[PDB]
Design a protein around this nucleic acid. Structure first.
Ligand SMILES: [Mn+2]
Length: 664
RNA sequence: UUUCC
């Protein structure tokens, strides 16, 4: 297709994305920035002692605890699935350059031999059925907003009062805005109600990424991460180039005088997108009720909490297949957006709301700073949104879009390769709805537990079982993609939402158990994705509000990992060698301090009652709110704790809004 | 804070 139009920041189309206030203006111009993070209060990620510690711990653990993953990617034994060199990154310093987001993924999908629409009428009915079951009998709830999160385009406000006003105003004018859009008046909808414009593209760190130690050379090698330059991004890959970013950290020495030990690299950086809040609010007001519905009625498939919660479902299976999806967000198909919108209209959803929804999935993107001297460019024209970026992480229902796509993708996979006998049950909408309603409740011989791009597919005893083994074998072979919709493979070291499925000698689900991933404990403790932001007075607004609290939930979260004790002892030993102090004592102090600080934020919490009323989930979330995005949901956290991290808009205002959106 | 869901 055509190249997407691009506008420099000086152009009026990009200028219009940033309000006439300092924050917005600074956000538009912010140049590439890097620097060591404050891993913990008073400790830099590049502190010589800390890097020495990481070098000793990483080698030691890898040495003594080699991965235990079989030929089918099932993990067993020590519950270790890879080496421990992932911790060897100079946290805060990114690979250069970060990628330019692809303005269109049509070609990327076509070239990967993925379909440009439902391949059969059956699939078409299943995707639409997914829409009818998910968006049908919704109950209004307060629109909850994350504290400290930015409203992005055009105001970039982080003020709760301002966010609540923006959100309330948005639920009030959404109808008018959507109708303007239905008339092709996007500039009007944006100018009047700030609904439109673009996603603000930021780069986030994936603090740990694969690193291997070459036996032959004795040198460490970081996994190459391919990035697209501007030409490639605007032409959907027809021109320009895709090349490996540089993770080499040598530069830190001459540039900053930072000492770079051997085998330490710059961090992998991923794109994140901040949505224009006025547009997302009306979307989030529907999205939450949808989540509430699927996590309740379809809890079997979609509601995952503890490792035992997962385990109970999986141990009833005769076969469990741990899938992997390649680059889910960028391959997400715009045809599914259009299918979902079309089906919502068929269900009687307000056209103006569906239009807001459709538009949220075609919005231009404003690229900030992928590298020194690059960026500050708007891709796509906000006057007529027509990008096909795949799925924007900042869209108000991103989790649901990925979940709807994949859940049906896996079911189709199970039907195609193992359960032809179930096809006669999917003949029209009613029967498709009935079958999907039953499958999602775990009532069929083929099952799944999934979230966005993570899942485990199951087969009980029955006719499909033999096909299930063939599918598994096909995946192991890795020669033929089992799906026409996304690039599916098997996970090397099967895990689901953070918990590794630990298999015994029988290599069967019934005798397998879910254990915490010890490598994630290390990632969270020694390679956080953000510094402690000690300059942000209000801790509820920080990326890591109460880092110390994770120590109190550690045993609960990682206690079942086979080498749990071993890792804690190796840490203690190496921290001793590097700092001359006890890591455990260090964490107990942090734990006490954050525990005291926390009572300042929790009203119900006695001005010093312990952590007695808090669950392990509560703790992990207070230390890392991001887990409330990729792992758990509001309902999994104690109510008094939830209020620490979120604030809501009146139920009355959303109720009125929701009534005007929904069919009946 | 220096920008996400
Ligand atoms: Mn998985």
């Amino acid at each position: 297709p055509r190249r997407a139009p691009a506008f420099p920041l000086s152009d009026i189309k990009a200028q219009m994305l940033f309000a006439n206030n300092i924050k917005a203006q600074q956000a538009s111009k912010r140049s590439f920035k890097e620097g060591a993070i404050e891993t913990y209060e008073g400790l830099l990620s590049v502190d010589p002692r800390f890097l020495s510690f990481k070098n000793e711990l990483s080698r030691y653990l890898t040495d003594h605890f080699p991965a235990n993953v079989d030929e089918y990617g099932r993990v067993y034994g020590n519950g270790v699935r890879t080496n421990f060199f992932g911790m060897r990154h100079m946290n805060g310093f990114p690979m250069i350059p970060a990628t330019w987001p692809l303005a269109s993924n049509l070609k990327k999908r076509a070239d990967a031999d993925l379909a440009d629409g439902p391949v059969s009428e059956r699939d078409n009915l299943l995707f639409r059925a997914a829409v009818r079951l998910m968006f049908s009998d919704l109950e209004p709830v307060p629109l909850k907003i994350r504290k400290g999160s930015s409203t992005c385009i055009p105001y970039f406000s982080n003020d709760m009062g301002t966010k609540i006003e923006i959100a309330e105003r948005a639920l009030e004018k959404a109808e008018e805005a959507g109708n303007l859009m239905l008339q092709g008046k996007f500039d009007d909808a944006y100018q009047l109600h700030q609904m439109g414009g673009a996603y603000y593209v930021v780069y986030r760190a994936q603090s740990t990424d694969a690193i291997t130690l070459d036996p032959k050379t004795g040198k460490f090698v970081s996994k190459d991460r391919m990035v697209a330059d501007f030409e490639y991004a605007v032409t959907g890959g027809e021109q320009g180039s895709l090349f490996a970013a540089s993770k080499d950290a040598s530069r830190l020495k001459e540039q900053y005088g930072i000492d770079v030990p051997d085998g330490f690299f710059c961090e992998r950086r991923r794109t994140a997108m901040g949505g224009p809040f006025a547009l997302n609010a009306p979307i989030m007001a529907v999205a939450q009720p949808v989540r509430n519905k699927i996590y309740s009625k379809y809890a079997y498939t979609f509601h995952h909490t503890t490792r035992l919660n997962k385990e109970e479902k999986v141990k009833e299976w005769s076969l469990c297949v741990a899938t992997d999806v390649s680059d889910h967000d960028t391959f997400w198909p715009g045809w599914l957006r259009d299918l979902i919108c079309d089906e919502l209209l068929n269900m009687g959803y307000a056209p103006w709301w569906v239009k807001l929804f459709e538009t949220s999935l075609k919005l231009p993107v404003y690229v900030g700073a992928p590298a020194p001297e690059q960026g500050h460019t708007l891709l796509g024209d906000p006057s007529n949104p027509d990008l096909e970026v795949g799925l924007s992480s900042g869209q108000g229902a991103t989790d649901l879009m990925g979940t709807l796509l994949m859940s049906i993708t896996y079911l189709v996979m199970q039907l195609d390769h193992t359960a032809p006998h179930l096809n006669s049950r999917i003949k029209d909408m009613p029967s498709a709805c009935r079958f999907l309603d039953s499958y999602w409740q775990g009532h069929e011989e083929i099952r799944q537990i999934s979230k966005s791009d993570d899942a485990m597919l199951g087969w009980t005893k029955g006719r499909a079982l033999v096909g299930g083994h063939r599918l598994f074998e096909m995946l192991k072979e890795g020669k033929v993609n089992p799906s026409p919709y996304m690039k599916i493979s098997y996970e090397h070291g099967g895990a689901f939402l953070g918990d590794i499925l630990l298999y015994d000698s029988r290599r069967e689900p019934g005798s397998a158990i879910f254990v915490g991933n010890i490598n994630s404990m290390l990632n969270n403790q020694f390679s956080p994705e953000y510094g402690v932001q000690s300059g942000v007075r209000d801790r509820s607004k920080r990326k890591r509000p109460f880092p110390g609290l994770a120590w109190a939930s550690m045993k609960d979260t990682y206690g079942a990992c086979p080498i749990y004790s071993d890792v804690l002892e190796a840490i203690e030993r190496c921290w001793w060698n590097a700092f001359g102090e006890s890591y455990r004592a260090y964490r107990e102090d942090m734990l006490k301090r954050d525990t005291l600080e926390l009572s300042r934020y929790v009203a119900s919490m006695a001005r010093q009652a312990g952590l007695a009323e808090l669950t392990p989930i509560d703790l992990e979330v207070l230390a890392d709110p991001n887990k409330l995005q990729y792992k758990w949901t509001e309902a999994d956290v104690s109510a008094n704790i939830h209020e620490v991290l979120m604030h809501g808009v009146s139920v009355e205002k959303t109720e009125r809004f929701l009534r005007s959106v929904m069919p009946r």
